[PDB]
Design a protein around this ligand. Structure first.
Ligand SMILES: O=C(O)[C@@H]1C[C@@H](O)CN1
Ligand SMILES: O=C(O)[C@@H]1C[C@@H](O)CN1
Lengths: 263, 263
């Protein structure tokens, strides 16, 4: 293992100011292909953990079931940056894989992840973030995650609620959405940015940053592996929890990094 | 009237190479507001010439019914550039207004306009182009027209056909679409570009350039006034024509430019 990676002070400042940051080329092509193959296995075998638009859209919880993905979350490319940004030991709250195949895709309601994790899972504060690993180059045209830079600084934003239980936390129509109303001011104030990057990049983003994405009109897929790390001190209150382990983790053991072994 | 506008030789070369070109800030804000108000009147009063996604999407043929838009097509900002690019006297084949309101919008099938005009209207060759006037700033996020640069150089491309008559020439689901198949090669060869620009710009594009667009996830509208000029020598063969005058013109009188008057 290479000496644990960390973000420069400029990178940190950029992440805190904007609410997101791209590191290019974290993983190589061969690494990405391993992850892609495992994702395909999880989409085939994940059963109730899968979501379909038909056509698989998402699979959840894979680090609990896949040895590859259980290792990935402890990678020296990821874990030390999460600990650096959250200023704590960390654990995985949620793991999901979101594909947008060429010429497919949904419009995804503008939203803040933390609203779901607070209300559905009992997350007490937004001291969490996600790492989105680019299984394919992310361009203007294959439905990139789209943010309001600085939009997290509001904290959590009162939001239109739709549905019962949690079924529609993972779908087209999201349970907690930001209406056109609130969005206009956000965007007049702050603008919109769809970070781009090559295959193998990682996109870090704040649990409270507003985000959205459109359809992929490209002939190329947009597969993302999203790992949500949470602060151990910020562990969710499992007595207010309403979802299964494969959406909202309950094992709060602090993660340690993978070490090099001969196998 | 200012001495008729024309494109520089670099601008021409760029248009011919890419198949599109943006001129920024052709019209001013006050001019644009006049056009916006007239568009709103046409959407209210156009009847069978209107198209709805509900919610108005398009209105067609307005230069035949609106004095403002009848003048616009003869504007010294537009007509002389069309004559320059088509190397002929010109007339209006088609006029349409396409709005994408904030948070609304459709995915539009990749396609070439000339395929419709050849097969539905009897246009003998692709010696035509469109001028898209930006009634609002066009950004990454409000569903900009998206092209394959150089994609017109194929000429017309064999295309999936769907429907009877012409009803679905103006809709979500288009009669002549380019499938994922053909699109992949195009885009590997040539890439994708979504020209941007401020309100009052004009986007010129070739009758044969492939194009597509996605939904507007912005809190801002994307209104476009699209004037399709055709070469008089390239006049459509009215004996193969299948659509009304307000989609496919039959008066081939060469246009002359507006001159300054006291009223
Ligand atoms: O339900 C959740 O937990 C996640 C948060 C957002 O990505 C939407 N779905
Ligand atoms: O039907 C037509 O004539 C136009 C050409 C494309 O803009 C699609 N509709």
């Amino acid at each position: 293992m290479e000496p644990h990676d960390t973000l420069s002070p400029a990178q940190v400042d950029e992440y805190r100011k904007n609410g997101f940051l791209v590191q290019e080329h974290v993983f190589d092509e061969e690494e990405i292909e391993l992850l892609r193959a495992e994702a395909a296995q999880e989409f085939a075998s994940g059963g109730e953990r899968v979501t379909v638009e038909g056509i698989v859209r998402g699979v959840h919880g894979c680090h609990l079931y896949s040895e590859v993905f259980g290792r990935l979350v402890r990678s020296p490319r990821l874990l030390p940056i999460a600990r650096q940004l959250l200023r704590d030991d960390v654990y995985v709250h949620q793991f999901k894989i979101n594909a947008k195949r060429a010429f497919k895709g949904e419009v995804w309601e503008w939203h803040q992840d933390y609203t779901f994790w607070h209300h559905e899972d009992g997350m007490p504060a937004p001291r969490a973030l996600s790492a989105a690993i680019f299984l394919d180059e992310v361009t203007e045209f294959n439905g990139p995650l789209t943010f309001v830079p600085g939009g997290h600084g509001s904290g959590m934003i009162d939001a239109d609620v739709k549905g019962e239980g949690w079924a529609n936390t993972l779908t087209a129509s999201l349970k907690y959405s930001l209406d056109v109303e609130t969005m206009r001011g956000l965007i007049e104030r702050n603008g919109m940015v769809a970070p781009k990057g090559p295959r193998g990049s990682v996109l870090w983003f704040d649990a409270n940053i507003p985000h959205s994405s459109v359809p992929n009109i490209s002939p190329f897929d947009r597969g993302l592996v999203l790992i949500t790390y949470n602060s151990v001190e910020n562990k969710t209150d499992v007595t207010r929890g309403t979802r299964p382990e494969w959406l909202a983790a309950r094992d709060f053991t602090p993660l340690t990094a993978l070490q090099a072994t001969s196998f």
